[PDB]
């Protein structure tokens, strides 16, 4: 079946309380109560929080709340501590005896003050594209909190295809960096006016854009 | 809960048969099921399937043409073989326990995972195959702070690991190499930049040097400007 929809990215500094939604449908969160919630460290194995919506497993921390409401369950963590920025995945049984999941929320705790990403796109250079090939690079630095989504543009139409983006990790000052891949053939870069990475960040959008004709 | 013990060979080539095994420590089958769960670099956490100690199986729909599931109760150990591989099918996959219950007549509870093994990391690729290197010549994107962002694009080698040094490693100052990212082809590529002053390019040399030690390549790649 088709995966809970989740927000990719909830920020609270400590002491906050926040809460992760988790869609779904009919067949899953809507008519059952069989949603869970599931925190990972990164390495570390999956650890469960919420079981059944809203049962908490002994050892679990009660600032840890499960609940439901139509189509949409929620995880709500009080008292925001720095040991809670992990990913969290929800997941539910359904009406045709499968499980599915999330596609998962990365919580920050703001340690430190936010830190708005620079964001420098490189062009295919000469020398790839020589080679019959085009990868364009988006750079991102010196952000904080370390969460960040990435959306490329054809002109002004959506590019899924081809597109590759890491994780953020600290650079040697101690903000974030990221990286976004599109790899494009000769052609698909030479038929468009131009391509731009958008880099999304803690509620606002920054902008790059390069063109074949440049 | 129990704890789940897994093994079996990560290293794979396409076509090929993951076989992966997971062993229960203390708890047994009982009434419950025992599932395989996927974590692919990219995406979030694939529902592979599941079994009971009887042999009752219930499979991913996207999967179940190339997956079957096995258990071995005298040595209370259950199984995953999923054939046919590609690079689609590189993942950490962990074995965990679905503790389902019946209430009553309608009523399912314990409908979540628990009992979470620590992984076996998957990749799929054909062969050892080193990395073309690319410059990313400087652009000037910090006008304020007058500095410029130059760079190597290391594309398409495997397996991991490939270290980036900076002019045979006496530029270490403001250089950051990311994280690789896999891409659907199974290859990797990377990006290593370096942060330097505007008036500083053209007159000092960039030289980055790429050494994918898996496969004995070494290059280095001249970095200069496009444009005065």
């Known amino acids: 079946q088709s995966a809970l929809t989740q927000p990719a990215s909830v920020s609270g500094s400590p002491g906050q309380s926040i809460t992760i939604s988790c869609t779904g449908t009919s067949n899953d969160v809507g008519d059952y109560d069989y949603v869970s919630w599931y925190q990972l460290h990164p390495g570390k194995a999956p650890k469960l929080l919420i079981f059944d919506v809203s049962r908490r497993p002994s050892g679990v921390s009660d600032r840890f709340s499960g609940s439901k409401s139509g189509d949409t369950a929620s995880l709500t963590i009080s008292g925001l501590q720095a040991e809670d920025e992990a990913d969290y995945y929800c997941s539910s049984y359904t009406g045709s005896s499968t499980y599915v999941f999330g596609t998962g929320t990365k919580v920050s705790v703001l340690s430190q003050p936010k830190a708005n990403p620079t964001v420098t796109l490189f062009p295919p250079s000469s020398e790839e594209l020589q080679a019959n090939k085009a990868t364009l690079v988006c750079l991102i630095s010196d952000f904080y909190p370390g969460a960040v989504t990435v959306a490329w543009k054809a002109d002004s139409s959506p590019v899924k295809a081809g597109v590759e983006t890491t994780t953020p990790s600290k650079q040697s000052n101690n903000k974030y960096a990221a990286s976004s891949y599109l790899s494009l053939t000769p052609e698909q870069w030479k038929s468009h006016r131009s391509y731009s990475c958008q880099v999304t960040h803690e509620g606002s959008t920054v902008e790059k854009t390069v063109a074949p004709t440049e | 809960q129990v704890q789940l013990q897994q093994w079996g060979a990560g290293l794979l080539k396409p076509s090929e048969t993951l076989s992966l095994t997971c062993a229960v420590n203390?708890?047994?089958?009982?009434?419950?099921?025992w599932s395989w769960i996927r974590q692919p670099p990219g995406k979030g956490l694939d529902w592979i399937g599941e079994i009971n100690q009887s042999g009752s199986t219930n499979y991913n729909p996207s999967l179940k043409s190339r997956v079957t599931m096995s258990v071995d109760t005298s040595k209370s150990q259950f199984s995953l073989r999923m054939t046919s591989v590609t690079a689609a099918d590189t993942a950490i996959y962990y074995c965990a326990r679905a503790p389902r219950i019946r209430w009553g007549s309608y009523r399912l509870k314990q409908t979540n995972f628990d009992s979470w093994g620590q992984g076996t990391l998957v990749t799929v690729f054909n062969q050892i195959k080193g990395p073309s290197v690319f410059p990313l010549a400087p652009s000037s994107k910090s006008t304020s702070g007058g500095t410029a962002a130059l760079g190597c694009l290391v594309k398409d080698y495997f397996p991991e690991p490939v270290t980036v040094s900076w002019n045979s490693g006496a530029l270490t100052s403001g250089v950051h190499t990311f994280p690789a990212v896999l891409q659907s082809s199974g290859l990797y590529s990377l990006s290593s930049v370096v942060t330097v002053p505007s008036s500083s390019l053209g007159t000092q040399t960039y030289i980055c040097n790429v050494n994918h030690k898996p496969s004995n390549t070494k290059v280095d790649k001249r970095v200069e400007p496009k444009s005065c």
């Open positions: 203390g708890g047994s089958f009982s009434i419950y099921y």
